[PDB]
Design a protein around this ligand. Structure first.
Ligand SMILES: [Zn+2]
Lengths: 330, 76
């Protein structure tokens, strides 16, 4: 159908509704539920756990078989996510990306299929070793691979490690406006590790000044960008309301790649917004419909149309991007 | 078996931690408070898509040398 169903607030659960709608409008994750491909991936025999995935899929199936102006209650799903993640027991407001990390962790767990080399091959081998422990249809969408290059300024050896990632938490490159590209450049900027942040260089056998640099070895099909909208002031968390100018189309991240290879352009399809103060704020979601390409505002039980020129606001907290196809020949 | 891991702070700069694989997450959060002044109950550490939970060790998450933990707070 149209998937324009609202989600009832069960008590400061707008953070949950916001993430649920972003996932509901993640096309391949939604089709995973609607086509019931998750049934073939659920585990059987002893020590199997399936209730979280089953209730998540039933909720997604309910959203995309409902009529317009319908309000769905995700109370049974909340029972399962809080069983898996006890942080969400009760009815206090939570952080949407903390909820996203725990939810995707539980969904992926219940459908899991459970030196001498150049940099590229070492990255490929470290990826295979990760897939020996984590490999699911959900991980096939979100997981990328970060490359961290640490060069000792004394001996010049560049130590490289490859960390998988399900999302990227980007610092706000604070200044009225800041672009998303600026936040990516700060994340990938060379970091001088000196003073008491000098790491141990095993070659030099001592603490040395080193230069650390992030790059992206593998780009995921779904790239989730989490904006670090906080500063710390005397033990008190303070929200950063700085307007971040992120694009709706043609987010080109080829310059942040480990190897200059072009398959790395994204288009926006969902945004999770946090408005208000650091505590007592409110969560909404702007989601592009996969079938029609039209944007809608999801504010708990209320779903209304919106223009694409209304999606980019200062409340954007999590950005959901999908990888575009490489350039067509002729 | 001591190793250096990194924590990406709120500004993007990394701090360096001297740790053992058997070090608990609260031990790691105690060191981050000494350098960043963020109480442990406010810190959230992300690695490979997982949020590090208190009662566990670094080895439980397969955190190796020179890996990077990503520090984030909470919007509520
Ligand atoms: Zn050295």
């Amino acid at each position: 159908a149209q998937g324009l169903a609202g989600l009832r607030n069960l008590g400061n659960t707008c953070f949950m509704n916001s993430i649920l709608q972003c996932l509901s409008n993640t096309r391949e994750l939604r089709d995973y539920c609607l086509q019931r491909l998750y049934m073939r991936d659920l585990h059987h025999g002893s020590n199997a756990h399936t209730a979280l995935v089953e209730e998540f899929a039933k909720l997604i199936q309910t959203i995309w078989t409902s009529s317009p102006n319908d309000v769905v209650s995700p109370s049974e799903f909340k029972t399962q996510i809080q069983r898996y993640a006890p942080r969400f027991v009760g009815y206090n407001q939570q952080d949407a990306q903390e909820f996203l990390r725990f939810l995707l962790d539980g969904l992926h767990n219940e459908v899991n299929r459970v030196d001498h080399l150049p940099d590229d091959e070492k990255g490929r081998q470290m990826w295979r070793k990760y897939l020996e422990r984590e490999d699911s249809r959900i991980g096939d969408l979100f997981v990328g691979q970060l490359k961290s290059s640490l060069t000792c300024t004394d001996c010049g050896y560049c130590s490289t490690v490859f960390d998988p990632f399900w999302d990227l938490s980007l610092p706000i490159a604070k200044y009225p406006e800041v672009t998303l590209m600026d936040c990516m450049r700060l994340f990938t900027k060379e970091d001088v590790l000196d003073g008491d942040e000098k790491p141990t260089c095993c070659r030099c056998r001592g603490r040395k000044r080193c230069i650390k640099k992030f790059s992206i070895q593998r780009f995921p099909k779904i790239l989730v960008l989490h904006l670090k909208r906080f500063s710390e002031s005397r033990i008190r968390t303070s929200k950063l309301t700085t307007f971040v100018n992120f694009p709706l189309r043609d987010l080109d991240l080829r310059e942040f790649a480990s190897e200059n290879t072009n398959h790395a352009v994204y288009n926006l399809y969902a945004v999770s917004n946090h408005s208000g103060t650091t505590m007592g704020g409110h969560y909404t979601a702007y989601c592009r419909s996969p079938g029609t390409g039209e944007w809608h505002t999801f504010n708990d039980s209320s779903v209304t149309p919106m223009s694409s020129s209304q999606v980019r606001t200062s409340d954007a907290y999590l950005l959901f991007y999908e990888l575009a196809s490489p350039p067509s020949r002729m | 078996s001591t190793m250096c891991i990194f924590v990406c702070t709120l500004t993007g700069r990394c701090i360096t931690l001297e740790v053992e694989p058997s070090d608990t997450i609260e031990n790691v959060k105690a060191k981050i408070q000494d350098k960043e002044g963020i109480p442990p109950d406010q810190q959230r550490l992300i690695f490979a898509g997982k949020q590090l939970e208190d009662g566990r060790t670094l080895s439980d998450y397969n955190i190796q040398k020179e890996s990077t933990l990503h520090l984030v707070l909470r919007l509520r």
